[PDB]
Design a protein around this ligand. Structure first.
Ligand SMILES: OC[C@H]1O[C@@H](O)[C@@H](O)[C@@H](O)[C@@H]1O
Ligand SMILES: OC[C@H]1O[C@@H](O)[C@@H](O)[C@@H](O)[C@@H]1O
Ligand SMILES: OC[C@H]1O[C@@H](O)[C@@H](O)[C@@H](O)[C@@H]1O
Ligand SMILES: [Ca+2]
Ligand SMILES: [Ca+2]
Ligand SMILES: [Ca+2]
Ligand SMILES: [Ca+2]
Ligand SMILES: [Ca+2]
Ligand SMILES: [Ca+2]
Lengths: 155, 155, 155
């Protein structure tokens, strides 16, 4: 029918405006504590927690901790860490097998950006160092999971 | 026609992607200062104001102060109060009739979570206590409306 | 066909709910650091940077610095500056031609709200004053671009 055609063209307009409005509100939301990379979105809570606290926080929020699988994804996190001037915990650990860092899924790294001479598993008073922190410069450093670091969740 | 069918199937795809993208951006927005319960959304501004200031703030923002009508809704607020480590004002008062706390609409409570021995209307120097604050543990305490408390708005 | 009609009516419902949900999530996002005026959206990052830093920040985020072209737009910014209690940089400068303040595009002001006796180009130790800051009261004051001021981006 011809009226059905009218309803469809109306929907096209409505959908177009929804798309425009949403694109704008994506940018607004991400400023300043969020970064979009691919279909991923990293966002910092602005606070610091231990690794396991941060892991619960991100999960409770409906996401997970950041698993940067590329340089572009790693760069985004670097920007958040820089803006906050606080090193942040990544999602990876080598708790299962020492020396081998893994994603929460069980699969080994497909990307890495260790700083000079890392990891080393030397946390001093803290003891072992099974988690990973990322610096403002984007470099990685294994660190005692019990330390407090910037919380960044991946959605 | 057959072309109209094509336009419709195109809209289905567009709408599906809008839905997926929006679900993701809902989670992103709510982290970390927001909680979704039913069709309600609680969000903290992170700051503290008197009851009447908080009431103007929430209204100006297009919402209202939190009227937790269930344990699930009350729990959500508890999580926000805990994260901020700041007690927050609820929307209810007994200003009209002493002893009887009411929603901004005029209707009496359909849910309550008073702490041991509350309310008591004893604010000391503050005087009377006609408003309600909620603790990190989720318990309620009547308090002088003139006090500064965490602002949480309901949308 | 009749089934196509069913799919279309289904889309209408889906779109209606998307619209409702989005309207709600617009209000949530804007609280408390955002203001909507027309098709524009102002949002503060909460931090302070020099004019050129703020300009990079806003651009990187996919927007620009605030170009208030009316009293309603200026009022919105005033509300953000007030809430933060921090004067903010606007997008306008007179760097090209002294005395004549311009938008980033190259066009002269279509609106202005200078405070008593401004601008004056007297920044003391700072030197010249080619940028513009806005006070909680909404009034404008030219200021050394090298100063640190509240960052507010326009999307
Ligand atoms: O506090 C322990 C940390 O000390 C830093 O200076 C580095 O040496 C890191 O490798 C180490 O994890
Ligand atoms: O400051 C007054 C408050 O003091 C607290 O210790 C409690 O006793 C509350 O009941 C009371 O509202
Ligand atoms: O610090 C310089 C500033 O000092 C303020 O008191 C005002 O006089 C401004 O006009 C001037 O830009
Ligand atoms: Ca180790
Ligand atoms: Ca180390
Ligand atoms: Ca009372
Ligand atoms: Ca009391
Ligand atoms: Ca000047
Ligand atoms: Ca001046």
């Amino acid at each position: 029918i011809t009226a059905l055609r009218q309803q469809v063209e109306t929907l096209q307009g409505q959908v177009q405006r929804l798309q425009k409005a949403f694109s704008q509100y994506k940018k607004v939301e991400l400023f300043p504590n969020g970064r979009g990379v691919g279909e991923k979105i990293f966002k910092t809570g602005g606070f610091e927690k231990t690794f396991q606290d941060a892991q619960q926080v991100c999960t409770q929020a409906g996401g997970q901790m950041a698993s940067p699988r590329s340089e572009t994804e790693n760069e985004a996190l670097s920007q958040l860490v820089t803006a906050q001037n606080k090193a942040a915990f990544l999602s990876m650990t080598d708790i299962k097998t020492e020396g081998q860092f893994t994603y929460p899924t069980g699969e080994p790294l497909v990307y890495a950006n260790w700083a000079p001479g890392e990891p080393n598993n030397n946390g001093g008073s803290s003891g072992a160092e099974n988690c990973v922190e990322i610096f403002p410069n984007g470099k990685w450093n294994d660190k005692a999971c019990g330390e407090l670091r910037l919380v960044i969740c991946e959605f």
